[PDB]
Amino acid sequence: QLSFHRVDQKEITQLSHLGQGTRTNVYEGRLRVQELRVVLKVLDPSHHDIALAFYETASLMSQVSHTHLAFVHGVCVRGPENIMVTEYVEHGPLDVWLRRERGHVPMAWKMVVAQQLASALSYLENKNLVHGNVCGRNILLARLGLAEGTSPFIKLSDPGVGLGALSREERVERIPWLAPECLPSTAMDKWGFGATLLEICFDGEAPLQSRSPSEKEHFYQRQHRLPEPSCPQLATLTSQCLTYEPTQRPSFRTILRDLTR
Numbered sequence: 612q613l614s615f616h617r618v619d620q621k622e623i624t625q626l627s628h629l630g631q632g633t634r635t636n637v638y639e640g641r642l643r644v645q646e647l648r649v650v651l652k653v654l655d656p657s658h659h660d661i662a663l664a665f666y667e668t669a670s671l672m673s674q675v676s677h678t679h680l681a682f683v684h685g686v687c688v689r690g691p692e693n694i695m696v697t698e699y700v701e702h703g704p705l706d707v708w709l710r711r712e713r714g715h716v717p718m719a720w721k722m723v724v725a726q727q728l729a730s731a732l733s734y735l736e737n738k739n740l741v742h743g744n745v746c747g748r749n750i751l752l753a754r755l756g757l758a759e760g761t762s763p764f765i766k767l768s769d770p771g772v773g774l775g776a777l778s779r780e781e782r783v784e785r786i787p788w789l790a791p792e793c794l795p796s797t798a799m800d801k802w803g804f805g806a807t808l809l810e811i812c813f814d815g816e817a818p819l820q821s822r823s824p825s826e827k828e829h830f831y832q833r834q835h836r837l838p839e840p841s842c843p844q845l846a847t848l849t850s851q852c853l854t855y856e857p858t859q860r861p862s863f864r865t866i867l868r869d870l871t872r
């Protein structure tokens with residue numbers, strides 16, 4: 612049921628460690644095709660079920676195209692080792708970047724990024740395909756857009772190991788990006804989008820970050836509302852996305868409409 616390119620280990624060179632993802636270590640690399648800069652996502656030693664969930668993500672990303680979705684080149688297998696080969700994006704994860712640049716990222720810059728992320732998720736909605744890991748960490752900054760007469764440009768990363776295969780402990784760690792219906796469909800990405808807008812508004816500090824797993828879990832079980840930004844028109848949008856009833860979240864047609872005025 613899955614389709615993606617098999618990458619020969621001879622085709623790839625591993626360079627410096629960039630950090631950890633869910634069950635992964637991410638490295639700068641080279642792919643010989645020309646010697647293309649890429650990232651290598653090396654899966655932890657894993658049960659077959661996690662390996663499958665990894666391949667499922669490679670299959671998903673290999674059959675979609677959008678200018679605000681990161682490219683997946685394929686999967687390298689090296690006996691028990693699984694390596695996803697994906698797009699290197701120049702300025703790296705947005706959450707890190709916003710925390711580093713805190714105090715000089717204008718609202719207009721943030722509204723461009725919200726619009727680009729909405730155009731990626733509008734495309735996935737129309738395809739009826741779930742990302743399931745929309746968050747600042749998975750938004751990659753291709754163009755800075757701070758210089759006068761420039762605009763930023765983002766790429767949404769592959770979601771990594773499918774949410775469906777992760778432990779309850781890992782799902783609780785992803786609150787408040789995790790849709791509440793996923794604690795125990797594309798509607799989950801509407802919640803994830805809303806949480807990511809708060810994260811962007813708060814310069815890479817998402818709500819409930821300091822809170823213990825039990826306190827994050829109770830927040831959802833009690834259906835506490837997440838904070839609203841002081842921009843009332845953006846607050847209306849985030850509050851509609853962060854609605855507990857999945858069927859009450861707005862379409863990406865409505866979201867894009869609201870962001871473009």
Ligand SMILES: CNc1cc(Nc2cccn(-c3ncccc3F)c2=O)nc2c(C(=O)N[C@@H]3C[C@@H]3F)cnn12
Binds near residue numbers: 637769
């Ligand atoms: C410059 N290019 C680049 C850098 C980078 N860096 C990181 C990858 C993973 C973790 N951390 C990371 N570690 C520890 C603390 C904070 C972090 F952000 C990193 O800094 N990641 C990527 C990716 C990519 O797809 N990354 C996957 C989605 C995760 F970020 C594509 N380009 N690129």
